[PDB]
Design a protein around this ligand. Structure first.
Ligand code: E64
Length: 209
């Protein structure tokens, strides 16, 4: 595949976000993926609402927990998601409004587990959301350079792989521009089930046209 690919320079990836003192990693991640797939086939780059998710994906748990195989189905079975402007962020759950369906997808497809060689495939076609063990000190206290550091698998956080390189990943978090490398964190590539288990639960939204 292309040795090195970045969806941030292609104009597919929106600026960094900030989930806030709220356990909504599961929403931010799974949502920024549906943002870049819609900015690839359609050609439009919109910032959808992570709040319509905390307020409507009842299946999940707003600010305290969430999974990918349930944030996606929500967005499809409902006709779509609403933008951020319309449905701004509040940093906490609440009722579920009369929002519109500005975007949507046909489904979602999972990538072969603990297989990074082919995860580089999906991430080479479009941003793929993943889960990791983002509770370690070095992880939580990463700033620059390529993060090798300590962390045992057993995922707890969700993010978006927006690119990669000869030996590292370009992970997209959701803790503001003041964390890691301007909101992002480059995680080394290859290892088995991945660094902080990166290749354990891969996933990305699909689309027609
Ligand atoms: C794979 C990714 C999506 C991890 C996921 N984490 C979350 O949804 C959030 O808590 C993420 C966050 O940092 O806000 C997760 O596994 N959450 C578990 C749900 C609650 C389990 N915890 C309990 N019940 N002690």
């Amino acid at each position: 595949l292309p040795e090195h690919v970045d969806w941030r320079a292609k104009g597919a990836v929106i600026p960094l976000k900030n989930q806030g003192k709220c356990g909504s990693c599961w929403a931010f991640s799974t949502v920024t993926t549906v943002e870049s797939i819609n900015q690839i086939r359609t050609g439009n780059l919109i910032s959808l609402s992570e709040q319509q998710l905390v307020d409507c994906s009842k299946k999940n748990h707003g600010c305290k927990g969430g999974y990918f195989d349930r944030a996606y189905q929500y967005i499809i079975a409902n006709g779509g998601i609403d933008t951020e402007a319309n449905y701004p962020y509040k940093a906490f759950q609440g009722p579920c409004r009369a929002a519109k369906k500005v975007v949507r997808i046909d489904g979602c497809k999972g990538v072969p587990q603990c297989n990074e060689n082919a995860l580089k495939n999906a991430v080479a076609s479009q941003p793929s959301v993943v889960a990791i063990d983002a509770s370690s000190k070095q992880f939580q206290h990463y700033k620059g350079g390529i993060f090798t550091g300590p962390c045992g698998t057993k995922l707890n956080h969700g993010v978006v792989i927006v690119g990669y390189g000869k030996d590292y990943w370009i992970v997209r978090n959701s803790w503001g521009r003041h964390w890691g490398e301007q909101g992002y964190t480059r995680m080394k590539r290859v290892g088995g089930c991945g660094l902080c288990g990166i290749a354990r639960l891969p996933f990305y939204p699909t689309k027609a046209x």
